[PDB]
């Protein structure tokens, strides 16, 4: 089969610079074979660019490409909110057909401090048998944000779940959740519960505890 | 006269077959196979290996016997003119030492942490993991012992780039720190110290590699990725890229112009056979990557057997094929501690003979041409080592990975192609093969053939122009994952490139400066050897 | 006025068989020929099999091969795909994709349909609440953890509240998912007011309502 490897699968944008995009084939592809699709997040995968260069239907002019042979490029000319997406690019040539790796564009803004909150496991759990506690981290840019359990006053690492949120439409930054799993008991011989954020916004972790004597 | 000699005939070998085998024997050449074609790669390897590869390696172990003194001072009295082949040959080695010994202090980062039963890289619920984490290497995602390796290790995830290297890893400082506290006092006497340790360095790997090698073997499927290794596709005999990984993997595996087969050979006897020493340790480097590779695809095999990944995946160069993907299958496998252990430590032992050869490079080419330098030769070290781990601190941030991966690719780049490029030329028609034959014979009490002498004069310069010239057209600016190095980055390697390659003209026209005479006489004075 | 939908599609162990429906309307049917592409959850496009206008014509991409079988109804406009032999590896969401013309590539997409291939058995979730500890305004969120498969539904009071409101994607654990929602209120409201969370996770009929309470 002919591999299709596209470039950068991650790229971040300010709204009005250019960008572009470029992927690259394994195998020759005739330039009116290949194509673009746009695909919003949770929404069905739309035509975008056919035949390398001819727009489709509803996109509007900002959008371009170019390329022939084993290597094409997507460029749009200056990036509107509303064009953050993942963007896959196709080969017709030949059977099995093919697509791209895909590049996924997402919007630059100011960075922002998180807001940490921490959760003790509701007492309906512990009935269960099981402890859990939850921590949640929303409003920050940039993405990549790292959490720390410290149990006082030492760090446990395993039983730990983090799960971050796609980026928003509006603010355009990014939330995460961290949660600790434990039995009941080990949340009985223990003390209390910490989870704490190391951000670029600062050097310094934003730090929230809470003890069940309290 | 006199300058001290090795303490045994032993210990000159291992320790040249110690700085020859490296992680790169390793890392780098049972990929090649697997990539290449397999078994039919080893059709290109040898050839290139014998018009090369060996002979460049028998010349520096040649001149270094024969001139009995350092880089420096050795290429001084074989041409005075090209005396700056002595200083890029030298601080070659020197920009190397920035980033290499990074690889060790990993290595017992990875052996420190391997003290428990419940491997930390093996699971996906830790602290320090993403949604996008798996068990094992898959397409798209993350394997556990992956995001080990960058989130929890090295904190590579806290930097953007090379412009923000952010804070410091302390644990990794520490690691560092013992790393060159092993090299202090393993370099800090003479060749009578440091020529006993290889012992271990050099031959401790074999010990492990045999134990993980009947470890290999016998999992389950790993007959398959036996096939995966050697499996004859001869189609790529064709193929010119093969020819030039071929060209490239036999000309850095074993290394000329570090200056260090040049130091090493420099406290031979004058007598002795240098031209068996050669052989014999050109061989066991050779067959050390490929008894290596059995070591890898064996478990490469086992993994694409009972853990149920793609080859494609796991099969993998650099230094995410030890600290990712073989780990990952340690862990599976029963007594896994046990593996970790020797493996990290073999990893260890692997990338220290390396270093003493580099840093001994250094120090003998300064003890020769300073004399005050072999005075108080610890002050020079400790002051050496210390501005080593002064900067070595720069490897140990978050974006520690960002600066060793730069330097890489461009101190020991192209600087060292052309640097050994005009080290054949300067010996085969400057100096003249038949000076360095007549040289050869007093010693071994023969000539060497015919085949010898026309490869140093012809086949090597192309040899070499050869791989420089299609290193070239293969030229990308340099790139790790998505991210993409600044052109400011790649701006500032090319002067660490050119800082040696710069020695060549320079000390070359400032010597014809000091010179009396025309053009005419002063160019004969300078290529006149020091036996004159 | 082109519509594609897909039916069919759901949790199968593996070696199993499944069939999958495609409903077509807003262009004639049998003058276009259509294509099964399915996309894994790495986000990552794969296509599996097309069929010509007349159905005359089959081409398999394959991982695929004599495992599954493309069929076409041009009378009910209706386009199937039959499976066999189902692996993990298999697991995607399947889109029923229109082209006729190569050149222009694939101009028109369904919403897709789900399908999960696994050994795991499925379970309920169980839902906890979260309470603050003893502001200008406050955070509440909703613990759903230990079920299979996806998808569930989480919303807050009755699916009113939008704003504030960051719902945390699942996670795979040992055959598990756990998944968690944050929605910020002022301290105005509560506990001015009754917060309410609520999950449905319709495979294993369990619909759950859970009530706040500071205590
Ligand atoms: C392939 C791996 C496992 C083993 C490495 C093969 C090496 C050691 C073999 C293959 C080809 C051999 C060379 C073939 C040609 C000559 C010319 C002869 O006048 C001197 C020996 C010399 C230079 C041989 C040295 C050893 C040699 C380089
Ligand atoms: C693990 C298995 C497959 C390979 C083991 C390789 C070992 C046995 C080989 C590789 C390199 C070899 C050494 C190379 C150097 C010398 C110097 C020589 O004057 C005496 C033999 C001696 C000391 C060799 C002994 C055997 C040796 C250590
Ligand atoms: O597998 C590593 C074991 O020790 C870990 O602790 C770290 C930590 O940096 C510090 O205690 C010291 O440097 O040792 C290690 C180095 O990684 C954790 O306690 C666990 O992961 C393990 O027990
Ligand atoms: C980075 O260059 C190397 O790794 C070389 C060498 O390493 C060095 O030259 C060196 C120099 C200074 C410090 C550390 C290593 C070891 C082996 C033999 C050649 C090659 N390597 C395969
Ligand atoms: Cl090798
Ligand atoms: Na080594
Ligand atoms: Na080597």
Redesign the pocket.
């Given at each position: 089969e002919n591999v299709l490897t596209q470039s950068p699968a991650i790229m971040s944008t300010s709204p009005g610079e250019k960008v572009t995009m470029t992927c690259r084939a394994s195998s020759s592809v005739g330039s009116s074979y290949l194509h673009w699709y746009q695909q919003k997040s949770g929404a069905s995968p739309k035509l975008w660019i056919y035949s390398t260069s001819n727009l489709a239907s509803g996109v509007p002019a900002r959008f371009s490409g170019s390329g022939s042979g084993t290597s094409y490029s997507l460029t749009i000319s200056s990036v509107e909110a509303e064009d953050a997406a993942t963007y896959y690019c196709q080969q017709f040539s030949g059977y099995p057909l093919t697509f791209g790796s895909g590049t996924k564009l997402e919007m630059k803004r100011a960075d922002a401090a998180p807001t940490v909150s921490i959760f003790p496991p509701s007492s309906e759990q512990l009935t269960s048998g099981g402890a859990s506690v939850v921590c949640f981290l929303n409003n920050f840019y940039p993405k990549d944000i790292n959490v720390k359990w410290k149990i006082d006053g030492s760090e446990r690492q395993n039983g730990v779940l983090n799960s971050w949120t796609d980026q928003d439409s509006k603010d355009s930054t990014y939330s995460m959740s961290s949660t600790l799993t434990l039995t009941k008991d080990e949340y009985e011989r223990h003390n209390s519960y910490t989870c704490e954020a190391t951000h670029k916004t600062s050097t310094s972790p934003i730090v929230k505890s809470f003890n069940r004597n309290e | 006269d006199e300058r001290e000699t090795w303490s045994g005939?032993?210990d000159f070998?291992?320790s040249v077959?110690g700085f020859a085998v490296d992680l790169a024997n390793v890392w780098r050449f049972p990929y090649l196979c697997y990539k290449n074609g397999g078994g039919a790669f080893l059709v290109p390897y040898g050839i290139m290996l014998a018009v090369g590869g060996i002979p460049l390696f028998y010349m520096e172990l040649a001149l270094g016997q024969h001139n009995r003194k350092g880089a420096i001072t050795c290429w001084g009295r074989l041409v005075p003119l090209f005396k700056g082949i002595g200083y890029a040959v030298v601080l070659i080695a020197f920009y190397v030492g920035f980033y290499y010994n990074v690889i060790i202090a990993w290595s017992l980062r990875f052996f420190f942490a391997s003290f428990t039963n419940s491997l930390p890289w093996t699971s996906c619920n830790n602290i320090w993991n993403t949604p996008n984490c798996r068990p094992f290497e898959s397409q798209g995602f993350q394997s556990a012992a992956s995001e080990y390796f960058n989130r929890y290790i090295l904190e590579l995830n806290r930097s953007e780039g090379i412009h923000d290297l952010g804070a410091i890893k302390w644990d990794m400082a520490l690691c560092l720190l013992i790393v060159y506290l092993i090299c202090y006092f393993s370099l800090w006497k003479g060749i009578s110290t440091s020529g006993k340790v290889v012992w271990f360095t050099?031959?401790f790997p074999?010990?492990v590699?045999?134990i993980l090698?009947i470890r290999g073997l016998t999992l389950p499927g790993s007959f398959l990725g036996i096939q995966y290794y050697l499996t004859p596709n001869f189609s790529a005999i064709y193929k010119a890229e093969v020819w030039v990984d071929a060209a490239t993997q036999v000309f850095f595996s074993l290394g000329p112009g570090f200056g260090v087969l040049l130091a090493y050979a420099s406290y031979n006897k004058y007598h002795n056979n240098v031209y068996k020493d050669a052989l014999?340790?050109s061989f066991?480097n050779s067959?050390?990557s490929f008894?290596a590779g059995f070591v890898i695809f064996s478990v490469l095999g086992y993994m694409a057997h009972t853990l149920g990944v793609r080859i494609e995946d796991v099969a993998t160069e650099g230094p995410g094929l030890v600290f990712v993907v073989y780990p990952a299958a340690i862990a599976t496998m029963p007594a896994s501690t046990f593996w970790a252990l020797i493996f990290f430590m073999m990893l260890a032992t692997l990338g220290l003979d390396s270093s003493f050869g580099g840093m001994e490079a250094i120090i003998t080419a300064l003890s020769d041409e300073f004399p005050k330098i072999k005075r108080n030769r610890e002050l020079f070290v400790a002051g050496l080592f210390s501005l080593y781990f002064v900067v070595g601190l720069a490897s140990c941030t978050q974006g520690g990975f960002y600066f060793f991966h730069l330097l890489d690719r461009y101190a020991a780049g192209y600087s060292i192609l052309v640097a050994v490029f005009f080290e054949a030329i300067a010996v085969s028609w400057i100096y003249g093969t038949n000076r360095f034959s007549e040289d050869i014979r007093d010693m071994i009490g023969f000539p060497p053939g015919r085949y010898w002498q026309v490869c140093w004069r012809f086949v090597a310069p192309i040899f070499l122009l050869f791989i420089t010239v299609y290193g070239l057209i293969g030229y990308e600016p340099l790139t790790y994952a998505d991210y993409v190095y600044p052109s400011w980055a790649n701006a500032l390697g090319w002067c660490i490139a050119g800082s040696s390659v710069v020695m060549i003209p320079a000390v070359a026209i400032f010597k014809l400066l000091s010179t009396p005479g025309s053009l005419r006489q002063r160019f004969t004075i300078l290529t006149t050897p020091w036996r004159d | 006025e082109v519509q594609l939908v897909e039916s069919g599609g759901g949790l199968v162990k593996p070696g199993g068989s499944l069939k999958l429906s495609c409903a077509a309307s807003g262009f004639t049917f049998s003058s276009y020929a259509m294509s099964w592409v399915r996309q894994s959850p790495e986000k990552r496009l794969e296509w599996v099999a097309e069929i010509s206008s007349g159905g005359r014509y089959i081409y398999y991409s394959d991982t695929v091969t004599g495992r599954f079988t493309i069929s076409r109804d041009n009378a009910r406009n209706i386009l199937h795909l039959e499976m066999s032999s189902l692996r993990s590896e298999d697991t995607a969401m399947y889109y029923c994709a229109r082209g006729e013309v190569r050149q222009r590539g694939f101009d028109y997409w369904g919403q897709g349909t789900t399908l999960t291939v696994s050994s795991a058995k499925t379970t309920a979730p169980s839902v906890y609440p979260l309470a603050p500890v003893c502001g200008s305004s406050v955070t509440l969120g909703c613990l759903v953890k230990g079920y299979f498969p996806e998808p569930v539904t989480l919303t807050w009071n009755s699916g009113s509240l939008s704003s504030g409101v960051h719902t945390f994607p699942a996670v795979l654990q040992s055959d598990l998912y756990t998944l968690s929602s944050s929605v910020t209120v002022t301290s105005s409201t509560w506990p001015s007011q009754s917060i309410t969370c609520n999950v449905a996770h319709p495979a294993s009929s369990t619909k759950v309502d859970k009530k706040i309470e500071p205590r």
């Amino acid at each position: 089969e002919n591999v299709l490897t596209q470039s950068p699968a991650i790229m971040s944008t300010s709204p009005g610079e250019k960008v572009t995009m470029t992927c690259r084939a394994s195998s020759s592809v005739g330039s009116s074979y290949l194509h673009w699709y746009q695909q919003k997040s949770g929404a069905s995968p739309k035509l975008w660019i056919y035949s390398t260069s001819n727009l489709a239907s509803g996109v509007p002019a900002r959008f371009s490409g170019s390329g022939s042979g084993t290597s094409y490029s997507l460029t749009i000319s200056s990036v509107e909110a509303e064009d953050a997406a993942t963007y896959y690019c196709q080969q017709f040539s030949g059977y099995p057909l093919t697509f791209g790796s895909g590049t996924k564009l997402e919007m630059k803004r100011a960075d922002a401090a998180p807001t940490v909150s921490i959760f003790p496991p509701s007492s309906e759990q512990l009935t269960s048998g099981g402890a859990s506690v939850v921590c949640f981290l929303n409003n920050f840019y940039p993405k990549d944000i790292n959490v720390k359990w410290k149990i006082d006053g030492s760090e446990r690492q395993n039983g730990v779940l983090n799960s971050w949120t796609d980026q928003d439409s509006k603010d355009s930054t990014y939330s995460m959740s961290s949660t600790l799993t434990l039995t009941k008991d080990e949340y009985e011989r223990h003390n209390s519960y910490t989870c704490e954020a190391t951000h670029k916004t600062s050097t310094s972790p934003i730090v929230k505890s809470f003890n069940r004597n309290e | 006269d006199e300058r001290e000699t090795w303490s045994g005939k032993v210990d000159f070998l291992l320790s040249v077959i110690g700085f020859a085998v490296d992680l790169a024997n390793v890392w780098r050449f049972p990929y090649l196979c697997y990539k290449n074609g397999g078994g039919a790669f080893l059709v290109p390897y040898g050839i290139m290996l014998a018009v090369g590869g060996i002979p460049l390696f028998y010349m520096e172990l040649a001149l270094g016997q024969h001139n009995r003194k350092g880089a420096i001072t050795c290429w001084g009295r074989l041409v005075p003119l090209f005396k700056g082949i002595g200083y890029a040959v030298v601080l070659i080695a020197f920009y190397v030492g920035f980033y290499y010994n990074v690889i060790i202090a990993w290595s017992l980062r990875f052996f420190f942490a391997s003290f428990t039963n419940s491997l930390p890289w093996t699971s996906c619920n830790n602290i320090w993991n993403t949604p996008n984490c798996r068990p094992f290497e898959s397409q798209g995602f993350q394997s556990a012992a992956s995001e080990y390796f960058n989130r929890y290790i090295l904190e590579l995830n806290r930097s953007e780039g090379i412009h923000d290297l952010g804070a410091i890893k302390w644990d990794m400082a520490l690691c560092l720190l013992i790393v060159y506290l092993i090299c202090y006092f393993s370099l800090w006497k003479g060749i009578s110290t440091s020529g006993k340790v290889v012992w271990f360095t050099a031959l401790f790997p074999y010990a492990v590699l045999l134990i993980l090698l009947i470890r290999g073997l016998t999992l389950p499927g790993s007959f398959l990725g036996i096939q995966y290794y050697l499996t004859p596709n001869f189609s790529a005999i064709y193929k010119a890229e093969v020819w030039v990984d071929a060209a490239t993997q036999v000309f850095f595996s074993l290394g000329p112009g570090f200056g260090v087969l040049l130091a090493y050979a420099s406290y031979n006897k004058y007598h002795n056979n240098v031209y068996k020493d050669a052989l014999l340790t050109s061989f066991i480097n050779s067959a050390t990557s490929f008894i290596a590779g059995f070591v890898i695809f064996s478990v490469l095999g086992y993994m694409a057997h009972t853990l149920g990944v793609r080859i494609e995946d796991v099969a993998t160069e650099g230094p995410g094929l030890v600290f990712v993907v073989y780990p990952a299958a340690i862990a599976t496998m029963p007594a896994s501690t046990f593996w970790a252990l020797i493996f990290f430590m073999m990893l260890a032992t692997l990338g220290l003979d390396s270093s003493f050869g580099g840093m001994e490079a250094i120090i003998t080419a300064l003890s020769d041409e300073f004399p005050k330098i072999k005075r108080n030769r610890e002050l020079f070290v400790a002051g050496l080592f210390s501005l080593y781990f002064v900067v070595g601190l720069a490897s140990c941030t978050q974006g520690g990975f960002y600066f060793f991966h730069l330097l890489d690719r461009y101190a020991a780049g192209y600087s060292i192609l052309v640097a050994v490029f005009f080290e054949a030329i300067a010996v085969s028609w400057i100096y003249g093969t038949n000076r360095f034959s007549e040289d050869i014979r007093d010693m071994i009490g023969f000539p060497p053939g015919r085949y010898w002498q026309v490869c140093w004069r012809f086949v090597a310069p192309i040899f070499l122009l050869f791989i420089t010239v299609y290193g070239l057209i293969g030229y990308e600016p340099l790139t790790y994952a998505d991210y993409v190095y600044p052109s400011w980055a790649n701006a500032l390697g090319w002067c660490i490139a050119g800082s040696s390659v710069v020695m060549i003209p320079a000390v070359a026209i400032f010597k014809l400066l000091s010179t009396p005479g025309s053009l005419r006489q002063r160019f004969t004075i300078l290529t006149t050897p020091w036996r004159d | 006025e082109v519509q594609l939908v897909e039916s069919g599609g759901g949790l199968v162990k593996p070696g199993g068989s499944l069939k999958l429906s495609c409903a077509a309307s807003g262009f004639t049917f049998s003058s276009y020929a259509m294509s099964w592409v399915r996309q894994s959850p790495e986000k990552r496009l794969e296509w599996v099999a097309e069929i010509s206008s007349g159905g005359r014509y089959i081409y398999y991409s394959d991982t695929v091969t004599g495992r599954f079988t493309i069929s076409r109804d041009n009378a009910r406009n209706i386009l199937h795909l039959e499976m066999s032999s189902l692996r993990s590896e298999d697991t995607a969401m399947y889109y029923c994709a229109r082209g006729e013309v190569r050149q222009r590539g694939f101009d028109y997409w369904g919403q897709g349909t789900t399908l999960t291939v696994s050994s795991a058995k499925t379970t309920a979730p169980s839902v906890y609440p979260l309470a603050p500890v003893c502001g200008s305004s406050v955070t509440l969120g909703c613990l759903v953890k230990g079920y299979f498969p996806e998808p569930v539904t989480l919303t807050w009071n009755s699916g009113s509240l939008s704003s504030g409101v960051h719902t945390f994607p699942a996670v795979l654990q040992s055959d598990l998912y756990t998944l968690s929602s944050s929605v910020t209120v002022t301290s105005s409201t509560w506990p001015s007011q009754s917060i309410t969370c609520n999950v449905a996770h319709p495979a294993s009929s369990t619909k759950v309502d859970k009530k706040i309470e500071p205590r």
